[PDB]
Amino acid sequence: MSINTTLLTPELYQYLLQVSLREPPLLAELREETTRSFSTYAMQTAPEQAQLLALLVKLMQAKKVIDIGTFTGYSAIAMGLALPKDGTLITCDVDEKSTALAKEYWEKAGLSDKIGLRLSPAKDTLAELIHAGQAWQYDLIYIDADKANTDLYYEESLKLLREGGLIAVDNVLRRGQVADEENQSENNQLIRLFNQKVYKDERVDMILIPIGDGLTLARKKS
Amino acid sequence: MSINTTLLTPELYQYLLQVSLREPPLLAELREETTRSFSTYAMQTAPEQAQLLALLVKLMQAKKVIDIGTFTGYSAIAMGLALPKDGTLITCDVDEKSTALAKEYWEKAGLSDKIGLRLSPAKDTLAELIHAGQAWQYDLIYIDADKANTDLYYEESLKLLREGGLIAVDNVLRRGQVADEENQSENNQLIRLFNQKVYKDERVDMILIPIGDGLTLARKKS
Ligand SMILES: Nc1ncnc2c1ncn2[C@@H]1O[C@H](CSCC[C@H](N)C(=O)O)[C@@H](O)[C@H]1O
Ligand SMILES: Nc1ncnc2c1ncn2[C@@H]1O[C@H](CSCC[C@H](N)C(=O)O)[C@@H](O)[C@H]1O
Ligand code: NI
Ligand code: NI
């Protein structure tokens, strides 16, 4: 047999949200506003995927988190709220307009002391962190920015992760396009190439969760 | 918007397995044999769901695991292989025929020292564990036996879990039947009632993963 997983219909999907999604009112408000104010609202993290991220922070008791791709800060705040008392999260983006709203909401959430915005190319922020002796220091890294650079960000995130640290990568399924070998758009070929790379990568243990637009988890092995 | 998750088609599902499923040959062999020898083969844990369980053992560095519902021992071995050097897993079932094959395979896997079979009603094994001072001692409990007793097993698993411990429950989606409020079969109403109970339970943080027949994760809060 196989299929061996119960596939989601719109019916089943809605039921799942009804018995699982516990969105904090502040985050709910944050995406109502993101929808209202940003034409790019759709690149926002799925409430259910973010909730899984929050659960991972708690399970690992992650004290050092990186959030690559702030936008209006949904995932940054989702994980921020799950941080233990002494935990910190730095969030990366290059867009001032969206991050300004992010700051606003994570202040309103009481996370100004835990979350710090690094406004500049993530490529640069990651290289500074390494070239400043932070390799092996991070527990959890969430990669959700420009897709062209996911391999770079992944490679850098490995260096920065402690032993047993976790990489989470969003949008690995590309709304299904990734299964169409003939789609052939630049970004689609990059993600197809990337998914095979991670699947073969013996530096990690991994899994691909069909939540949000697909969430790959890669644990850095001993 | 919403749907907010990329739903799995058979096409996408197959692609997902191709870029994520890393089944150990021994486990592959175990389910070929289970299919061949057991008319009840279908209640076996999905390779991809088991793989997620293995990843959770590693992330938590779980040293004490319970496996409720051995069958031919797929999940017991999947998690067993991920156990740290000093980790142990006890597996529960009442069926001698299937557990005998389980023993055989987890010996062949080199896990005879880590896995211990408790052959008797899980209800009894769990009560012994508690009535013998093991409350708060376990890291991860996987509930996958008789569905009529999932609430009982859940309730007992909370007592046995350490702070920050994890309950994993399989078959919460019931191949979709659970979304049909008018299905009404005894077991379907029990799981619908259970899913709402967990969703409302403030003793845990939870998430429902659409992998296998649905996997609910509930972390015991501080
Ligand atoms: N070179 C770069 N460095 C940092 N951020 C970048 C970048 N290129 C694009 N981005 C940002 O990556 C973001 C993609 S979407 C962000 C999603 C976010 N996790 C959420 O919860 O909503 C955009 O905000 C975009 O501005
Ligand atoms: N009261 C009970 N106590 C313990 N096990 C029980 C039980 N009632 C049913 N079971 C067992 O629960 C199992 C259900 S299926 C087991 C799935 C297993 N996790 C795997 O990886 O394949 C059956 O083997 C059945 O024998
Ligand atoms: Ni995204
Ligand atoms: Ni099952």
Nearest to A20 among B54, B55, B199 (CB): B199
Task: State how far the alpha carbon of B204 is from the alpha carbons of A128, B85, B154, B199, in Å.
Answer: 38, 28, 11, 9
Is A175 in contact with B6 (Cβ distance < 8 A)?
Answer: yes
Tokens, residue A141: 């890294």
CA gap A102, B97 in Å, rounded: 58
Cα dihedral sign, A145-A146-A147-A151: negative
| CB contact at 8 A, A143 and A168 | yes
Contacts for B124 with CB less than 8 Å, ≥ 6 apart: none
What are the residue boundaries of the structural domains of chain B, listed by start?
2-222
Length of chain B (residues): 222
Task: State how far the alpha carbon of B121 is from the alpha carbons of B64, B112, B114, B127, B150, in Å.
Answer: 20, 22, 21, 10, 13
Contacts for B78 with CB less than 8 Å, ≥ 6 apart: B27, B45, B50, B51, B53, B54
Q: End-to-end CA distance of chain B: give it in Å, rounded.
A: 35
Q: Please count the CA atoms within 13 angstroms of the CA of B94 that sit on its side-chain side.
A: 9
Q: Under DSSP, is residue B68 helix (H, G, I), strand (E, B) or coil?
A: strand
Ligand 2 binding site (Cβ under 6 Å of any ligand atom): B 43-45, 69-72, 74-75, 92-95, 98, 121-122, 144-146
The minimum CA-CA distance between A174 and chain B, rounded to whole Å, is: 8
Cα–Cα nearest to B42, from A180, A164, A6: A6
Distance of CA A18 to the CA centre of its chain: 23
β-strand pairing of B161-170 with B115-119: unpaired
Nearest CA to ligand 2 atom 12: B145
| CB contact at 8 A, B67 and B75 | yes
Number of other residues whose CB lies within 10 A of the CB of residue A196 = 12
Question: Ligand 4 (ion): which residues have CB within 5 A?
Answer: B 144, 170-171
Question: What percent of chain B is helix, strand and coil (3-state, nearest 5)?
Answer: 45, 20, 35
The DSSP code for A118 is E
The minimum CA-CA distance between B158 and chain A, rounded to whole Å, is: 15
| CB contact at 8 A, A211 and A52 | yes
Residue type, B132: A
Is B176 in contact with A9 (Cβ distance < 8 A)?
Answer: yes
Experimental method: X-ray
- 3-class secondary structure for B102-169? HHHHHHHCCCCCCEEEEECCHHHHHHHHHCCCCCCCEEEEEECCCHHHHHHHHHHHHHHEEEEEEEEE
Tokens, residue A29: 């408000």
Contacts for B73 with CB less than 8 Å, ≥ 6 apart: B30, B91, B98, B99, B101, B102, B103, B105, B106, B115
Mutating to test ligand 1, I would choose from A33, A38, A43 the residue with most ligand atoms within 8 A of its C-beta, which is A43
Cα–Cα nearest to A216, from A157, A134, A133: A157
The DSSP code for B172 is S
A132 interfacial to chain B (CB closer than 8 Å): no
β-strand pairing of B138-143 with B64-68: parallel
Length of chain A (residues): 222
Tokens, residue B126: 């769990």
CA gap B131, B135 in Å, rounded: 9
Index of the ligand 2 atom closest to the CA of residue B44:
22
Task: State how far the alpha carbon of A132 is from the alpha carbons of A64, A121, B85, in Å.
Answer: 16, 17, 34
Which residue carries 């175990």 as its tokens? B30
Nearest to A210 among B8, B60, B219 (CB): B8
| CB contact at 8 A, B221 and B205 | yes
Task: State how far the alpha carbon of A182 is from the alpha carbons of A29, A192, B6, B189, in Å.
Answer: 39, 11, 19, 45
Is B20 in contact with A206 (Cβ distance < 8 A)?
Answer: yes
Mutating to test ligand 2, I would choose from B43, B45, B68, B153 the residue with most ligand atoms within 8 A of its C-beta, which is B43
Cα–Cα nearest to B145, from B126, B167, B171, B164: B171
Contacts for A131 with CB less than 8 Å, ≥ 6 apart: none
Does the domain at A2-222 match CATH 3.90.79.10? Answer given as no
